[PDB]
Amino acid sequence: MDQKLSKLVEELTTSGEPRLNPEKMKELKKICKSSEEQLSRAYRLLIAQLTQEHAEIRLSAFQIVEELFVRSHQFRMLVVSNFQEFLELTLGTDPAQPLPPPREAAQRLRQATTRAVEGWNEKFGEAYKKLALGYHFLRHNKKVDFQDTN
Amino acid sequence: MLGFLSARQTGLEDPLRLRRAESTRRVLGLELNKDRDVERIHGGGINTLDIEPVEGRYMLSGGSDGVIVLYDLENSSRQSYYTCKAVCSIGRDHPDVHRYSVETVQWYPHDTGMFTSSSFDKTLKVWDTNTLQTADVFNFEETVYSHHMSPVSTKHCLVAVGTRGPKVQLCDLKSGSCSHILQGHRQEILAVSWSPRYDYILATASADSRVKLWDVRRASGCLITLDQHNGKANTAHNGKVNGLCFTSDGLHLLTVGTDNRMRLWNSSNGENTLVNYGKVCNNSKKGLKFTVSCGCSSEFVFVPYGSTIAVYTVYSGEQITMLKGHYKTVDCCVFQSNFQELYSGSRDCNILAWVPSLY
Amino acid sequence: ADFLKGLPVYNKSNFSRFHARRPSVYLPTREYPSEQIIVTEKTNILLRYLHQ
Amino acid sequence: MSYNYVVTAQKPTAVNGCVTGHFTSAEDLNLLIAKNTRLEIYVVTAEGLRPVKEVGMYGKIAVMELFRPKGESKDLLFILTAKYNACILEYKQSGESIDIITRAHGNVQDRIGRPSETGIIGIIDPECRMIGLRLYDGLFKVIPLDRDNKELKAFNIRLEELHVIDVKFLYGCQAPTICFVYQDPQGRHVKTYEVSLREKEFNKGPWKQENVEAEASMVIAVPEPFGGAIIIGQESITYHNGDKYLAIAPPIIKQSTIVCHNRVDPNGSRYLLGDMEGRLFMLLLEKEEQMDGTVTLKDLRVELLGETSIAECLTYLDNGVVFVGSRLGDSQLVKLNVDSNEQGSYVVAMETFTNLGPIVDMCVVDLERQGQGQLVTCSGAFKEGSLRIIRNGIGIHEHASIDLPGIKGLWPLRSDPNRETDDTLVLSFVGQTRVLMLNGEEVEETELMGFVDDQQTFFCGNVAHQQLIQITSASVRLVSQEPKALVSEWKEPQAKNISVASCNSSQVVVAVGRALYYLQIHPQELRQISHTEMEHEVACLDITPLGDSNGLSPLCAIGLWTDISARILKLPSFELLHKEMLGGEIIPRSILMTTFESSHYLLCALGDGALFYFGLNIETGLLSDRKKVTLGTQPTVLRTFRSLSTTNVFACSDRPTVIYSSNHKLVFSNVNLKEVNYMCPLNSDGYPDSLALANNSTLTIGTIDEIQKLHIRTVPLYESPRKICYQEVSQCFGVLSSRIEVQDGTTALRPSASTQALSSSVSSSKLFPHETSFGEEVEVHNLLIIDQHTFEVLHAHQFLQNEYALSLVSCKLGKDPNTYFIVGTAMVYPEEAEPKQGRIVVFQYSDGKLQTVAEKEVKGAVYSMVEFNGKLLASINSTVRLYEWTTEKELRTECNHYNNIMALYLKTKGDFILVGDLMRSVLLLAYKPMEGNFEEIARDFNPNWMSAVEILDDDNFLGAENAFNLFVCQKDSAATTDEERQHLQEVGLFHLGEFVNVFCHGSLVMQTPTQGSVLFGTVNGMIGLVTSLSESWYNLLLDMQNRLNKVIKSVGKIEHSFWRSFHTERKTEPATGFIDGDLIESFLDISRPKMQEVVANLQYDDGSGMKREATADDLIKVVEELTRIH
């Protein structure tokens, strides 16, 4: 089961397609629903994929993280526990660690992350005030323009 | 927790032992409270926090944007989750608003009505809290890097001001004069702090890598100069000593330098006690404010360690913990000894509260 | 027990007529001037050490 | 505002300090015992510890030392108080004038500084040159003992060792040397310093720094010729003398921790040690003498002398007698006889002084069901744990107990005229009489010539002209003293029966139905003087001669049937002087004329337990100021009796009482016996200054206390008691107990109360893992059901292993009519910072058999619980929850309130709930019966570590502090905003000086300026009473308190204001809204001129609301009423 989850995460992150395969994503969601340990393993795998020096892989990993965040409470807990590293890996907040190439995929990842963090603050900011704090941290402290196309 | 209650009831251990042990346990369990919060009003960073001394109900936060906020820690909401509302604030609307950042804010240790705020605007203002109007103003030639009033002094209310200038200034609030000037330093004095034990002793740290202890009575010379090596020179650190604070009892002094070192000294004779606190990362060019616990078994020191808060031990040196949460570098840490609470004002415009969670 | 031999007896009669009464409370009314007063020398320790 | 009055019903009994020396005279051994604020000075005479004096200090005595500077005839005493008041005092006794002269006084408090973890330490040199105080770590205060200078300049010296475990001054060294054990991250080290006065500094000590046992905790300065010091840890006793280092690690010591020590031999050969377990060891130093002539130490030896009360500070008094002062148990006076008893213990308990504290919990229970609330307190800890029943009253010390049932009367009699003491005891029965002779202690049946044994006696005794009288139902018989023979006999004209009798030495008055006959006693004649007929049948009579009348009463007191009227008659005319209608249809049965404090009274007792008393004018026969009290339900028999040359009245009934007079105010105090039917005083040779008492079947002869006191019974439990609540329905007490058992399973150290219960069950919850190593202790908790009468553990329910019972409440829940024992328990595993589980268990003690009615697992520890409108309000960790008792006999969670850091103390009144937080001061909640939350009505934001709470009334809330303070908060209902209302204003403050653990409503005085009443117990066994007062009374008392402060000069020159000022680590303010009871009560003990000085020009209300000039007699009366309440 664990090797199947690992293989599915690899195939979803190394596919290079702009959109995730819906069948493999359904299988992944079923496995994450089957056990909380499998959900935590998927989380750890997605974090280890966000560390890869490839913007397409990071984009696909982020899309999976977003879907599991919207669909799973414990995945939300996991993401919030390491929200700083997540934001560093996805928006490139740290100037010493810029987003990996290609530039277009990195820009798409940044846009998607900004929109997702906005919608997460809108939907869960009252309870998840932690993620909310970081939101404003990048919004005002980091003058991240939410209305900017890029 | 039951053992201490049973011991107190039976009298095996005096109540002070339970008090101190429980306070130490609570300080160990300090954690970022998600429920309690302090409303984000500041548009910029927080350069200082200071809870009023008499009862620890009101806190003063000076921001980088020149806004003073008088937060109330009294939980009037009756709710586990609540936001410490800003009872009042001096912002850009208020005419006497500090145009630039307010570096430090310090209540009157005698009367809670008045409080002192010094800013990068070259000015130190004494406000009241009945009308929050600037009761008095003092203008200097150099930006006030720090200012402190003796907490153990009732005879005079002397204010010691350290600025970009290498001369310490001593001004009398009762007489409304900035007469006294103490000389001997070479560059900006980043931290001035009166000794809580001895009324007329002032410790001044500068970027000249030296900490000088002075007696105000003798307007001639400085008493002592702290040397890390004890003459084996005459320099507190290898860089800028931008943090200074006496221990609660005043028998020891803690100095934080830009060399990323925190050192403890005897306040009586000024020889390095040689406590190894390790690398306390500190890259702030402005005076770094750190606070020491009070009424606890082991006196803790909370130092802004980058964007975390490093809690060490003043009488052992062991790094008790490193509280995380702030997104930007932590700037000021203020400790409410009444409930073993901590409130750190980072430059992210957030006032994070840290409380002992035990269940 | 050889070691319990010799417990020092201050007086032979003490506890010789032991029998198996609470003290009267002392309530002074007169005042005799205190010969001495204890005042903590305020001499600053650090100043003394430096000057030494 | 709020007004309150605090008095000390019982002085603290825990012994804090003990020192032997020569205080009162250079040639007298004097023992000084510090019990918190009390300092008792005894002399070790042949009789024992004769109490010379008891000094009340305005401060907690933290340091006591007897030091004799060279040139002083007798030792001076150095006292430091917990508030850092230092005072050197001396004893000066000129004739009868005993004085405690404050030779030196001052305050050694520093503005800032951390109080030492080990606490205040006070030491004096061997030569008495300087006094060293370790108050705050890192600072050693030195007070030089120079005599010439007027000012003693105490100066601090820096200590580079912040954590100093212990400090002592060494002998065998020229300069003042301090040896101290101090701690640091490496471990514990023993270090030496030289205190230089001129330099005012420390110099390098004679020895090196040497590592010591990791738990080195005590330092002993061995005097010459050994020198050096002894370091006592937990396993190893070491001895350091410069280079000479010795160490011994006996296995016996390792079991317990040695907490106190004393030097037996002056040369340090022998020492006494006492461990926490209570064991007493003797430490031997074997001197060896070198050929050169210098004596050094050979080896250390520790010997377990025996087992005594848990020692707080031992002090070998003299002649093999050791005073084992105790704090967790009764203080003891033991003898170390050379030869061990068969048990192998050399210690013989010579005497035991009762120690009441620590009072973990207490209840006020009308066990007697008589109306006199008794205090049942859980006292002591470990083996010393026990229950204490503090029954106010007077106690008899009977010396004889014969078996004679159905006695109807008792009379003392003097057979021999020469013998000024009685030797005869006549008894009455069913139409018969028995005479008993008293030959020392021999009590046996006799017959007396002239007396009839076939008629019921109504009176007999010694009469004028060396004669004896016996009055029966048949006649009155006169007998001569020396020649036992009838010399005169009187009978009713028609030979009818005598029904009532009265007699003094010269006069007789008897009734025959309505007929009354007055007889006089002359040589061999009963002279009939006069006769009358009363309106009704005669119930009772008295002719007791009062005032200056010389044995001849002009008056006769009489009680009548039908009209129930107490009447005063003139003798010999029988003229009505006063008729008093008593009321009801219950006849008088006993009447008496007596003098209390040169004031004359008439007492009349009815057959229904009522007693009327009146002022009596012995010239006019006028009765005034009619007052009525109840004394049981049976008819009262009244009998006078001299005690310490003071006349009292014994009132026999189902409730023995002594009637007396206090400050011109009749006082009633309950005797300590089930029921007395008849009584008489008795003063024979084998029973001097005694009493004869009779009930249904027993005849007892014993002595009696002059007045009353808080007599305390003790029931040993041999295990720490924690909580107590009384179950009225089952006539049982439910007590939580804990005992320590060492890993074997586990075995208890000693037999206890839980193990020997008549029935022992164990809880086996299915609701619910460590390997305790051998020799590891475990706390086993039990619920003890104890019969209220025999106070014997009828039942013992042992809880699960690793389960602590924390809270207990006896109440009925919901609509269930059965009364239950509801006990909350937690599970304390060693590795958990706070417990993670717990449960509430509902037991029912029925048909003498406890049963687990219900149970309720719960996440957390149930700190406290209280009945609340039939609902269980339980504090579980950081929450307070409500439970209801369903029809299934189960608990159902209703709602929870997380706004509580740690509800440790809960009190409820009506719809209010007072919550004592661990450090968040007092909260006041009001449960929602419509919604379900605990809307926090108000709270106090002052950071206050709480030890107890109480609800004085709807607005006042009393609370205690961790620093021995009391405060009273008030809900500002006058507030006009929700903000002001949510704030509780601290309207009163006080520094009690004791750590009060428990509050309880109730009074110990048979039921006024003072309203309400709350008793409270402290760690020092000091029971105190707090009551309310009116504004005018509070103002008067405060003014008198200030004036008394002016007049009374405290010992040590400490100001009462500075002593009672509210004091904590964060603030210090004067006492307000509180009146010190002890100082006010001391007004009764200041001489009359001092009374006048105190009452000088004081404006006071005498009940008319008009400010008069308070006199010394107005304030005395004011203080006599206040004293009566406790």
Residue numbers in the entry:
A (entry chain D): 1 to 150
B (entry chain A): 1 to 232, 240 to 366
C (entry chain C): 2 to 21, 30 to 61
D (entry chain B): 1 to 744, 748 to 771, 777 to 1015, 1022 to 1140
Question: What text appears in the publication on this structure?
Answer:
TC-NER is initiated by the stalling of RNA polymerase II at DNA lesions, which triggers the assembly of the TC-NER-specific proteins CSA, CSB and UVSSA. CSA, a WD40-repeat containing protein, is the substrate receptor subunit of a cullin-RING ubiquitin ligase complex composed of DDB1, CUL4A/B and RBX1 (CRL4CSA).
To investigate the binding of DDA1 to CSA, we assembled part of the TC-NER ubiquitin ligase complex and determined its structure by cryo-EM at 3.4 Å resolution. The first and third WD40 domains of DDB1 (BPA and BPC), CSA as well as the N-terminal region of DDA1 were well resolved, whereas the exposed second WD40 domain of DDB1 (BPB) has multiple orientations relative to the other domains of DDB1. The VHS domain of UVSSA (in pink) binds to a corner of CSA. In this structure we found DDA1 to interact with both DDB1 and CSA. The interaction of DDA1 with CSA is in a similar area of this DCAF as the DDA1 interaction with DCAF15, but the details are different, as DDA1 has clearly rearranged itself. The DDA1 binding groove of DCAF15 is not conserved in CSA, and we did not observe the full helix in the interaction with CSA. Instead, low-resolution densities were identified around blades 4 and 5 of the CSA β propeller. We could visualize DDA1 up to residue 61, but the region where it binds to CSA was poorly resolved and we could not build any model with confidence. By applying a mask and focused processing, we found that the densities in this area adopt multiple conformations, suggesting that the interaction is at low affinity and transient.
